[PDB]
Amino acid sequence: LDNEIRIFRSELQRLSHENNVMLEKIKDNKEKIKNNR
Amino acid sequence: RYDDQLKQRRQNIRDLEKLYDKTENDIKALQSIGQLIGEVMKELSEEKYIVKASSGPRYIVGVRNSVDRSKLKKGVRVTLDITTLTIMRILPRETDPLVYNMTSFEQGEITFDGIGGLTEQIRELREVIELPLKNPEIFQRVGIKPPKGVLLYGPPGTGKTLLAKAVAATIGANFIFSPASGIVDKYIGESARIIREMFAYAKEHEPCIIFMDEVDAIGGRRFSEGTSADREIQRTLMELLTQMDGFDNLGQTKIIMATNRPDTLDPALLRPGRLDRKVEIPLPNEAGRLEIFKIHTAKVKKTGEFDFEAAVKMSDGFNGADIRNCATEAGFFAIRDDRDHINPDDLMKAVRKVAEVKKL
Numbered sequence: 001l002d003n004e005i006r007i008f009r010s011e012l013q014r015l016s017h018e019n020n021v022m023l024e025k026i027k028d029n030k031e032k033i034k035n036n037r
Numbered sequence: 038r039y040d041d042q043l044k045q046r047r048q049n050i051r052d053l054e055k056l057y058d059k060t061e062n063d064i065k066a067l068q069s070i071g072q073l074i075g076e077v078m079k080e081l082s083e084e085k086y087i088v089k090a091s092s093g094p095r096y097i098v099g100v101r102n103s104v105d106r107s108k109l110k111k112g113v114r115v116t117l118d119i120t121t122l123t124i125m126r127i128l129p130r131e132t133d134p135l136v137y138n139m140t141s142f143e144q145g146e147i148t149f150d151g152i153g154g155l156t157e158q159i160r161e162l163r164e165v166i167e168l169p170l171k172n173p174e175i176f177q178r179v180g181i182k183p184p185k186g187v188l189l190y191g192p193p194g195t196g197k198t199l200l201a202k203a204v205a206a207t208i209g210a211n212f213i214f215s216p217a218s219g220i221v222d223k224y225i226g227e228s229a230r231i232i233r234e235m236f237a238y239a240k241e242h243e244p245c246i247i248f249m250d251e252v253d254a255i256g257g258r259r260f261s262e263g264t265s266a267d268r269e270i271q272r273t274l275m276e277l278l279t280q281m282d283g284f285d286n287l288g289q290t291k292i293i294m295a296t297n298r299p300d301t302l303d304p305a306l307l308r309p310g311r312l313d314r315k316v317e318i319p320l321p322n323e324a325g326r327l328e329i330f331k332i333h334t335a336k337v338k339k340t341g342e343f344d345f346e347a348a349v350k351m352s353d354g355f356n357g358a359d360i361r362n363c364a365t366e367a368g369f370f371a372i373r374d375d376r377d378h379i380n381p382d383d384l385m386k387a388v389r390k391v392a393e394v395k396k397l
């Protein structure tokens with residue numbers, strides 16, 4: 001199962017990119033409301 | 038090993054797609070700033086209506102493309118912008134369930150009504166009101182015009198609110214009831230809007246009965262000075278009359294009213310042909326009070342006896358609604374003697390205070 005970690009690490013590298021992205025667009029709106037509050 | 042470290046991520050992401058869509062929803066609403074509320078007097082053209090705001094003035098306005106000019110007529114409630122003042126949207130059904138509420142099971146056709154006191158009334162209203170509703174295609178060809186309305190007067194403290202609630206429920210009629218207080222208590226100068234809605238709602242749920250107490254409140258000044266400050270106390274009678282004249286008296290809507298002081302009534306209308314049939318109502322008698330005391334007192338853990346007969350013969354000069362008090366006038370002495378099953382001694386001295394309570 002050597003090819004496992006050579007592969008199933010790749011997806012892990014992806015979802016971190018998927019997480020930090022979605023983590024910010026909410027931060028964007030999270031500040032807007034305070035500007036209009 | 039390196040699989041579980043990822044399996045927590047597909048859960049992570051979907052746990053944000055929920056979060057995102059919310060924070061993206063709200064901004065989609067904040068741009069949609071508020072509006073202002075009004076009401077209509079009349080109509081002039083599809084390009085120009087009239088309104089009356091909820092803060093005084095009587096603007097003139099235009100109207101947007103979408104809304105049907107058909108539905109826009111008098112009486113309607115309206116919404117519009119703040120600067121241009123152009124009407125866009127409508128909201129009907131000025132709900133106030135504290136005001137009224139339906140009794141659909143009153144359209145059961147077999148409902149219970151077995152409280153005491155009165156039989157010929159429930160016997161006769163059945164005559165006054167059943168036939169014009171169930172198969173009224175005969176009142177025309179015979180020749181006469183049936184009664185558009187009714188009035189039920191009497192002394193206070195008699196429990197008639199439940200009566201009219203009942204007999205329209207056994208007959209199988211959709212009953213609704215609203216006092217004439219909140220319509221003038223909650224709603225000072227926005228009242229008669231409720232009236233017409235109370236009928237339209239009542240219409241499309243035809244057949245149906247009305248009931249409404251404290252009806253002597255519409256009078257107010259009754260044009261006691263003709264000043265333009267009591268427009269509410271004046272118009273609130275107007276919209277009442279114009280609407281009940283609009284029934285045509287076919288046999289799918291009838292009306293009931295009530296108070297204590299019919300001599301205080303406003304026969305500016307409601308006397309001649311609107312509330313045509315006037316019906317007084319009696320008080321109990323030598324056995325009705327046992328027909329009454331068999332109701333309330335029966336519903337509590339007494340000792341079990343029949344001093345009622347020897348009791349009420351001592352009673353006299355006795356109104357009706359003082360009886361929920363009379364039992365509890367005794368209930369406030371059973372607990373004092375640290376009891377569960379009371380005796381008639383509390384009842385034999387029950388009224389002995391209550392007779393003086395009628396003094397003031």
Ligand SMILES: Nc1ncnc2c1ncn2[C@@H]1O[C@H](COP(=O)(O)OP(=O)(O)O)[C@@H](O)[C@H]1O
Pocket residue numbers: 152153154155192193194195196197198199250329332357358359360361
């Ligand atoms: N005939 C009756 N049978 C049972 N209860 C009655 C009767 N008459 C009056 N009551 C009592 O009086 C109260 C209802 O009176 P109410 O509806 O206030 O009269 P009105 O509508 O004329 O003011 C209730 O608590 C009820 O138990």
